[PDB]
Amino acid sequence: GKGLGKGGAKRHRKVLRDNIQGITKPAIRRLARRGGVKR
Amino acid sequence: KPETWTSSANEALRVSIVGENAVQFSPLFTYPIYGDSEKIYGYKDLIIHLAFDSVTFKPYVNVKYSAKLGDDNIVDVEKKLLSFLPKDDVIVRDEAKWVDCFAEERKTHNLSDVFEKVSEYSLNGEEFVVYKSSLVDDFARRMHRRVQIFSLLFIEAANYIDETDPSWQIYWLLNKKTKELIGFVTTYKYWHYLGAKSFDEDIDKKFRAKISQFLIFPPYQNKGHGSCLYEAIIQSWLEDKSITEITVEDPNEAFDDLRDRNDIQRLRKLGYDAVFQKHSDLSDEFLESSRKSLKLEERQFNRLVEMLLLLNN
Amino acid sequence: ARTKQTARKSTG
Amino acid sequence: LSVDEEYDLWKSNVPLMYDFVSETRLTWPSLTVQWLPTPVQELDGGFIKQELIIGTHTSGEEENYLKFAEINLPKEILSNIRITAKYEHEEEITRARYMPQDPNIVATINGQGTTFLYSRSEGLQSTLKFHKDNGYALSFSTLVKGRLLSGSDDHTVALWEVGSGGDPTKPVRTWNDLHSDIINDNKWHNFNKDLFGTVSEDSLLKINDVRANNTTIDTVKCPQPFNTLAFSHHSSNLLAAAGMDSYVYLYDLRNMKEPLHHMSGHEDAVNNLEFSTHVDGVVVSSGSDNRLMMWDLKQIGAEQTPDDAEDGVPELIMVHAGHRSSVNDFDLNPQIPWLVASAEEENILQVWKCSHSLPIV
Ligand SMILES: CC(C)(COP(=O)(O)OP(=O)(O)OC[C@H]1O[C@@H](n2cnc3c(N)ncnc32)[C@H](O)[C@@H]1OP(=O)(O)O)[C@@H](O)C(=O)NCCC(=O)NCCS
């Protein structure tokens, strides 16, 4: 974690989605960075 | 009442800064120390004192309880706590030995002649000075190891930073008269690649500077220090020709508003409020030039411009 | 520091 | 996840992430992959054609071949594979590269360090024998026709001249003193016709000058050894190197004391590195973690939301997770931006292009 002061874990894991949606441009961008292999 | 043997760690952990008066307060977070539930089981009437000298921040620890379950698998609260404080720099249980130790330390204690001064300001008739240091220095390391637990107790997801990384730079806020530490800010710098032309022209290396952990100790909050400290740093970065942008790691809503306030009035003071809310007909290269001149992060920049466009439409 | 592999043919 | 569980997961998201993906099983695994600079030409049937050089590795069971492959891509990339030429080769092909100034000529190197000159039209032309053991390093100057640089596991580096007359089977110059262990890679600089770089198992990275008696201008100690290095095609000062510790490092040639930055993402050693010729600041890496990763140097240190920081550092554009084994080699197509050819150990060559929806494209 190069130069990270807040890279620890959060208190809790959020259950609500700040964006439920099908696919959009930043959804594709996030998908690619995940390599399309997250859950 | 056997449930009195389960405590909220946020309540049990009593944090004190002792200057003239011992000022006591609670942590916001304890989970990275005592687990996600922030509960401690097995101790009755549990108290955990974590105290610091208001100047040298010599840490003291003392754990109290009326009873403790004998069986193992219950947490050694003191051991856990000490594992997050500097090794062999914490006085355990003996208040008077602790007072002795920091009374002797205040004699030789002077950041004002080991650190580079940054700026100086005035709040409520008191004079404050801002200092800067690396984290490879032995004395900066002594102080930082002492205060970094405050990052964990008060900033969510905070982690301890790598003191061997030379790109760490800490800013220190002292009360000029009393020599007391009001806050500290951990900052970092990343190479900024501006494309082949620029890179090949300036042999002088360019960086995005970053505010990472920004802490004003609870006793000194809500008095205008954060704004003055945020303002001092940004200003010295505006004067640093190696810095291209100012960035912030994971800010909370409080810092969101602090950043927005101070950035907003810098733009007003430079007249960009009037430039943007009265002149739609601007080249895109004026917008870039403005941003670069201001050293603002791109998305923050857009927010402020839109915020100005609408505020005086 | 690459580790040259052992080769295999096609299962059809 | 299992690698097969993960592969089906990747495959279910292919239509969203890629404009194009094709997968091909090879009788034998290739250790090398390069696109030819054959110009885009549309064929009858609405396809455009590209060409690819690949090789074989049989571990001695069959004979080896230098292969030339025709790739027929969808017209909208601005669809099978076909081997149009097949030349026999002495031992496995560890690296094969075409001469920039004359694409009829392909240089190869094998597992005994022998270097070959093949013609597309006539086949094996010359044998260049000097290195005495396997070599992964092979590089043509883009700036001086025929200038060839080879490197071996036997710590040696050779310079040849093959873009003229005379006999090319004898090296113009050799070095036994550059490194004290395996030569992992060597590359010509892209602006300075005399510069080249070496990275070795001796944890050194060296910048060298062919004109000079004392060859080396700069020596750099590497955290663990680097397996590869690449020079920018846009900046004459910028280079990148990576290896056993998984990080991709950037260096400024004007000051090699410390790296500029290192990029984190790979979970194992990095084996290949490349700068985009199309977009200044784009670096693509691959290695033992079975992955290809595309990077954008202009986002190094950019501000992220905490939710984005969770998917990786801001400079990471994309991860290619289509392979099910370590990546042997990949190449960026010089005619069609973002088109990639990559080849894994388990006899698979994929050809792919990221989604146009990616901000970077
Ligand atoms: C920065 C910090 C010290 C606050 O600094 P600040 O500049 O005073 O912040 P604020 O602007 O929100 O608060 C000042 C307000 O209190 C008021 N105030 C000033 N002096 C006061 C006093 N003596 N009595 C009561 N109120 C007072 C002011 O009027 C001002 O309000 P205004 O804008 O209407 O004029 C603190 O709140 C903080 O952020 N600490 C860091 C802890 C943390 O979690 N950091 C994570 C960041 S990584």
Side-chain angles (χ1 to χ4, degrees), chain A residues 1-38, chain B, chain C, chain D:
Chain A
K2 200 202 200 276
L4 299 198
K6 300 199 190 192
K10 285 76 195 183
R11 214 303 203 73
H12 280 104
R13 208 185 279 185
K14 34 189 199 152
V15 337
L16 293 187
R17 282 211 219 169
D18 282 21
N19 201 312
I20 257 203
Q21 195 172 21
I23 48 110
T24 39
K25 234 190 186 189
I28 299 305
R29 167 175 174 282
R30 281 182 291 89
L31 225 206
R33 278 158 51 81
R34 294 194 190 105
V37 285
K38 173 183 286 186
Chain B
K1 40 172 56 195
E3 67 263 359
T4 56
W5 293 62
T6 300
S7 350
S8 164
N10 289 319
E11 283 177 21
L13 180 53
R14 325 285 196 89
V15 185
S16 304
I17 298 180
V18 185
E20 307 202 311
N21 309 130
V23 180
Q24 181 180 144
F25 46 91
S26 276
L28 289 190
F29 310 106
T30 43
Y31 75 97
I33 298 182
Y34 291 111
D36 287 314
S37 79
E38 304 194 326
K39 300 299 180 207
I40 298 179
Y41 167 78
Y43 293 76
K44 190 188 196 301
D45 300 334
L46 174 68
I47 310 181
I48 302 170
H49 282 296
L50 179 58
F52 300 89
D53 166 50
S54 76
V55 161
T56 72
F57 270 76
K58 181 67 182 184
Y60 162 84
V61 168
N62 173 225
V63 182
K64 305 200 139 305
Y65 52 90
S66 66
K68 163 200 179 66
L69 292 179
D71 62 302
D72 296 337
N73 327 321
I74 87 162
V75 188
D76 192 335
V77 296
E78 185 189 86
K79 203 184 177 160
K80 246 311 169 56
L81 183 57
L82 288 166
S83 86
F84 286 89
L85 293 150
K87 214 156 302 155
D88 298 327
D89 200 29
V90 182
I91 286 149
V92 179
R93 193 201 294 275
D94 193 336
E95 275 207 4
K97 173 181 182 189
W98 171 61
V99 183
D100 273 333
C101 185
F102 75 72
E104 198 71 25
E105 273 200 38
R106 299 201 192 206
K107 302 177 172 180
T108 83
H109 195 82
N110 206 31
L111 277 63
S112 320
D113 74 332
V114 161
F115 295 162
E116 181 183 320
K117 179 178 172 185
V118 176
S119 69
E120 191 165 327
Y121 68 86
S122 288
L123 256 199
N124 327 133
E126 263 171 323
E127 297 201 330
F128 294 98
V129 61
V130 176
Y131 281 92
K132 178 179 45 180
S133 98
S134 78
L135 227 200
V136 313
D137 184 300
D138 275 26
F139 177 69
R141 279 179 185 189
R142 202 201 200 178
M143 285 299 287
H144 180 251
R145 288 169 172 181
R146 285 175 175 189
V147 300
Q148 64 172 359
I149 198 171
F150 279 86
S151 290
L152 295 185
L153 290 165
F154 299 97
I155 301 171
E156 185 171 14
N159 61 264
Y160 281 176
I161 66 169
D162 190 343
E163 38 174 44
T164 77
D165 195 328
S167 286
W168 280 112
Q169 209 68 16
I170 308 181
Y171 286 74
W172 308 86
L173 177 61
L174 286 319
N175 176 288
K176 184 183 194 178
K177 195 188 183 315
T178 70
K179 271 54 174 175
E180 292 177 320
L181 190 63
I182 308 305
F184 69 95
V185 182
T186 62
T187 72
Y188 201 82
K189 61 177 183 169
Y190 295 96
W191 178 50
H192 194 178
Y193 183 55
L194 299 170
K197 191 193 209 329
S198 324
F199 182 59
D200 291 342
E201 281 174 350
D202 350 322
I203 68 107
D204 355 32
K205 193 176 172 194
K206 293 304 176 58
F207 303 88
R208 281 159 155 144
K210 187 184 76 166
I211 289 171
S212 175
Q213 303 148 336
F214 192 107
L215 209 296
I216 298 292
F217 302 116
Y220 316 117
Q221 284 171 19
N222 303 290
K223 304 178 191 300
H225 278 295
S227 286
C228 290
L229 186 55
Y230 172 80
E231 216 177 78
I233 296 162
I234 272 55
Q235 184 52 46
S236 75
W237 285 356
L238 285 167
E239 299 176 350
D240 197 333
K241 27 159 274 192
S242 56
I243 310 303
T244 56
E245 283 185 16
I246 300 159
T247 65
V248 189
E249 183 182 358
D250 186 15
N252 56 22
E253 183 178 9
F255 202 90
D256 273 8
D257 291 20
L258 187 148
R259 187 184 190 186
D260 281 7
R261 225 194 55 97
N262 298 257
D263 291 3
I264 271 287
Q265 239 130 244
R266 200 167 107 232
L267 291 177
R268 298 202 208 267
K269 188 177 163 191
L270 297 185
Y272 286 101
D273 54 351
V275 171
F276 288 138
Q277 83 205 349
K278 288 155 62 178
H279 197 30
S280 156
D281 323 313
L282 288 161
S283 58
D284 267 73
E285 76 194 325
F286 174 71
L287 295 157
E288 252 224 290
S289 295
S290 310
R291 190 179 60 79
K292 294 189 177 183
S293 178
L294 288 154
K295 295 202 177 189
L296 267 37
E297 186 269 317
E298 180 151 29
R299 285 178 105 98
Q300 169 74 343
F301 178 70
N302 298 340
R303 288 169 73 267
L304 294 169
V305 173
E306 292 165 8
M307 194 171 324
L308 282 161
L309 282 176
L310 303 169
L311 245 32
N312 265 285
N313 51 287
Chain C
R2 312 163 210 250
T3 301
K4 195 181 292 169
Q5 57 182 103
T6 307
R8 270 174 176 258
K9 239 253 247 266
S10 275
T11 46
Chain D
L1 269 191
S2 98
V3 304
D4 293 289
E5 293 168 6
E6 199 181 37
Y7 177 78
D8 291 320
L9 184 52
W10 167 78
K11 215 200 313 173
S12 74
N13 283 315
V14 164
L16 294 175
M17 292 177 56
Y18 304 80
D19 288 355
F20 179 86
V21 172
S22 96
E23 183 159 345
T24 293
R25 268 253 169 57
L26 304 178
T27 298
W28 287 108
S30 176
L31 302 186
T32 191
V33 170
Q34 199 180 29
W35 296 97
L36 279 153
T38 297
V40 176
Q41 178 61 57
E42 185 186 347
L43 297 198
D44 159 84
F47 295 110
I48 82 106
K49 118 157 169 185
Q50 289 294 262
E51 295 180 292
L52 211 56
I53 300 165
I54 71 183
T56 51
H57 178 40
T58 60
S59 282
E61 303 199 26
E62 284 188 15
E63 318 219 26
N64 287 295
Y65 289 97
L66 171 62
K67 291 180 174 175
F68 295 77
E70 192 170 282
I71 326 287
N72 296 274
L73 311 163
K75 184 184 178 171
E76 54 178 352
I77 205 161
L78 309 179
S79 180
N80 286 79
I81 190 185
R82 192 210 189 173
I83 309 292
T84 72
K86 181 183 189 170
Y87 296 112
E88 208 176 289
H89 195 267
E90 189 169 277
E91 296 300 317
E92 69 268 4
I93 309 206
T94 57
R95 191 156 210 248
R97 315 288 282 172
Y98 72 86
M99 191 193 306
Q101 295 93 0
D102 182 9
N104 175 67
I105 290 169
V106 172
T108 68
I109 182 173
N110 73 349
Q112 301 178 322
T114 313
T115 297
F116 294 106
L117 293 194
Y118 282 78
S119 170
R120 297 193 62 182
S121 51
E122 300 188 50
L124 184 60
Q125 301 279 71
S126 304
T127 307
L128 276 46
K129 229 320 181 191
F130 169 67
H131 306 299
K132 307 185 182 49
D133 195 9
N134 161 88
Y136 270 101
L138 194 66
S139 186
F140 273 110
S141 168
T142 232
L143 292 175
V144 171
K145 173 185 187 188
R147 190 171 269 185
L148 180 61
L149 200 54
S150 67
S152 179
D153 294 349
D154 73 3
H155 325 354
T156 63
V157 174
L159 173 72
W160 324 73
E161 293 288 336
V162 303
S164 49
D167 189 286
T169 68
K170 263 41 168 189
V172 157
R173 182 169 188 194
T174 66
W175 299 259
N176 325 69
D177 59 337
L178 274 177
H179 296 268
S180 69
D181 202 325
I182 303 181
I183 307 308
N184 291 327
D185 204 351
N186 53 227
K187 301 292 177 74
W188 291 104
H189 194 259
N190 287 321
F191 299 85
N192 195 328
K193 60 176 182 102
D194 297 309
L195 281 219
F196 66 96
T198 35
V199 291
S200 168
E201 267 300 276
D202 66 4
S203 285
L204 300 178
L205 152 58
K206 282 206 180 173
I207 308 304
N208 312 291
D209 181 315
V210 271
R211 279 171 307 143
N213 299 300
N214 266 277
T215 305
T216 304
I217 292 173
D218 273 297
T219 310
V220 166
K221 212 177 175 187
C222 315
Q224 296 179 56
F226 289 150
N227 292 340
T228 180
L229 76 166
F231 293 106
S232 167
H233 297 286
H234 300 262
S235 169
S236 59
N237 297 293
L238 208 216
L239 69 320
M244 299 305 308
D245 77 8
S246 82
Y247 298 109
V248 180
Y249 294 81
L250 296 318
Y251 291 93
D252 171 3
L253 282 178
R254 302 166 298 199
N255 179 72
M256 305 283 294
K257 306 183 186 237
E258 306 282 348
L260 288 162
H261 178 68
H262 56 96
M263 298 184 299
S264 70
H266 284 288
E267 321 254 51
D268 209 334
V270 175
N271 298 318
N272 306 73
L273 215 40
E274 232 84 46
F275 279 88
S276 168
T277 67
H278 300 293
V279 184
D280 172 35
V282 173
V283 167
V284 179
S285 63
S286 64
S288 294
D289 70 337
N290 308 5
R291 299 266 191 270
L292 270 109
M293 305 197 181
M294 310 205 300
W295 312 86
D296 180 9
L297 274 44
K298 298 189 176 194
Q299 299 298 308
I300 290 170
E303 197 166 303
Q304 299 176 301
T305 48
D307 261 30
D308 244 303
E310 293 181 4
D311 300 325
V313 295
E315 57 260 43
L316 171 82
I317 299 166
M318 201 242 194
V319 173
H320 174 80
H323 290 297
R324 278 161 277 181
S325 52
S326 292
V327 179
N328 290 351
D329 196 8
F330 71 94
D331 193 57
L332 272 22
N333 183 303
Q335 289 84 232
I336 313 175
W338 309 107
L339 186 64
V340 186
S342 53
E344 63 176 282
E345 287 189 7
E346 315 293 14
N347 311 11
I348 287 273
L349 157 75
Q350 296 180 343
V351 164
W352 52 274
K353 181 179 166 164
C354 69
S355 173
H356 62 267
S357 279
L358 262 50
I360 194 74
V361 7

